[PDB]
């Protein structure tokens, strides 16, 4: 049965609610982004209207095989009418195609559903600023003060400089980047651009990237592994055993690997600035863990919510336990007392 936090009150809308079969009373199903926990349940068997971004629509058609008749793509930053209700899609600064949804309810209430997002100050100068938002459905993945991370830009600068030095020292070195879903494409795109290379990958991953509306994509990516000095592999293969095996597959064209493992937060964010990062090394393989996040840090989330000043917050992440719900409610109350709303 569909949770209250996936329902938009006073409409027949749901958000990211595809795993419960037919939701009683739902006339439009919104999908914020193409990550499997959010799309879970969608397939060629789905026969109700799905509303989403153009990129998400491309992935639904080509990867999940949802029939075109049921896909309703909407443009960004544009006031649209769905089933008689005014809505706007905004860029979520998450993965490609990911949106936040603003609902203007018939009774005058305004609701923002963030989907998954990485809060940014640029959001404070969007359409959100034009009117009071009453209710916020919030991505609370990192809603605790221990969760700090660097900017995406600091992480990319470190990755570019690391890769350029290693390949200039050894022109027979290969660069490998781990992946398991869409998102974090700038890691491998920026490394390949500094090296003057295309990115090589499997046919299944190439198919995915070709759905993302990236300008000039045909000049950036290839299925011809031999021709390229940056390769993509499943995140599970970024270990010494997997990378040795891969080296053997490539036909001696390379004699060394430098690999990147973009993660979320892991315990050591607590001490270590990006400039101090050192890799784990075994013989001719070196692996760097890089904290490249597509979710808000605690400080980023707190800034956005204190700017927005909602009357109610509904969390959408870590809502399955009491302990977690209670801890989040304590931070919301602090934020509200500090900022006066």
User: What residues line the site for Ni ion (CB under 5 A)?
Assistant: 35, 116
- For the chain, give the longest Cα–Cα distance: 67
The half-sphere exposure of 159 on its side-chain side, counting CA atoms within 13 A, is 31
In the complex, minimum distance from the CB of residue 114 to Ni ion, in angstroms, rounded to a whole number: 11
Our CB check for Ni ion shows the closer of 6 and 35 to be 35
Q: Least CB distance from residue 35 to Ni ion, whole Å?
A: 4
Task: Pick between residue 35 and residue 198 the one whose CB is nearest to Ni ion.
Answer: 35
Minimum CB–partner distance for residue 180 and Ni ion (Å): 12
**Of 39 and 254, which CB lies nearer to Ni ion in the complex structure?**
39
d(CA 37, CA 147): 22
Q: Nearest-CA neighbor of 316 among 113, 135, 109? A: 113
Q: How far is the CB of 33 from Ni ion (least distance, A)?
A: 6
Comparison of 14 and 56: residue with beta carbon closer to Ni ion: 56
Residue with smaller CB distance to Ni ion, 138 or 259: 138
Q: How many CA atoms lie within 13 A of 334 on its CB side?
A: 11
Backbone angles phi, psi at 71, to 5 degrees: -105, 125
Q: CB of 340: closest distance to Ni ion in angstroms?
A: 32
Minimum CB distance to Ni ion smaller for 98 or for 238: 98
CB of 84 to Ni ion, least distance (A): 29
Complex with Ni ion: residue 116 or 185, whichever CB lies closer: 116
Q: How far is the CB of 157 from Ni ion (least distance, A)?
A: 25
CA–CA separation, 117 vs 90, rounded Å?
11
Shorter beta-carbon distance to Ni ion: residue 141 or 197: 141
Minimal distance in Å, beta carbon 183 to Ni ion? 7
Contact 139, 115 (CB under 8 A): yes
């Amino acid at each position: 049965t569909c949770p209250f936090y996936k329902k938009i009150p006073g409409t027949g809308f749901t958000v990211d609610a595809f795993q419960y079969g037919v939701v009683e009373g739902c006339t439009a199903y919104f999908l914020t982004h193409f990550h499997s926990d959010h799309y879970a349940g969608l397939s060629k068997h789905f026969t109700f209207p799905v509303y989403c971004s153009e990129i998400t629509g491309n992935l639904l058609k080509n990867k999940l095989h949802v029939q075109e008749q049921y896909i309703h793509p909407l443009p960004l930053d544009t006031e649209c009418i769905v089933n008689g209700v005014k809505v706007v899609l905004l860029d979520a600064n998450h993965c490609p195609g990911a949106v936040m949804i603003l609902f203007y309810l018939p009774n005058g209430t305004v609701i923002l559903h963030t989907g998954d997002f990485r809060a940014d100050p640029s959001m404070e100068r969007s359409l959100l600023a034009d009117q009071k938002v009453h209710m916020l459905y919030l991505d609370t993945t990192y809603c605790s003060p221990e969760y700090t991370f660097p900017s995406q830009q600091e992480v990319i600068r470190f990755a570019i400089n690391t890769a350029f030095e290693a390949v200039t020292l050894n022109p027979h070195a290969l660069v490998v980047c781990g992946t398991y879903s869409i998102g974090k494409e700038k890691v491998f795109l920026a490394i390949a651009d500094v090296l003057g290379s295309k990115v090589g990958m499997s046919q299944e991953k190439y198919k995915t990237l070709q759905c993302l509306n990236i300008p000039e994509i045909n000049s950036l990516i290839t299925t011809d592994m031999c021709s390229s000095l940056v390769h993509l592999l499943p995140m599970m293969q970024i270990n010494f055993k997997g990378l040795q095996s891969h080296l053997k597959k490539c036909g001696g064209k390379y004699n060394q690997i430098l690999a990147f493992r973009p993660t979320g937060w892991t315990h050591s964010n607590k001490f270590t600035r990006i400039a101090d990062v050192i890799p784990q090394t075994k013989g001719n393989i070196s692996i760097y863990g890089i904290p490249y996040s597509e979710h808000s840090s605690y400080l980023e989330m707190k800034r956005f919510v204190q700017w927005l000043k909602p009357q109610k917050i509904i969390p959408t992440v870590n809502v399955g336990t009491w302990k977690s719900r209670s801890t989040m409610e304590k931070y919301f109350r602090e934020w509200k007392l500090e900022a006066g709303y």
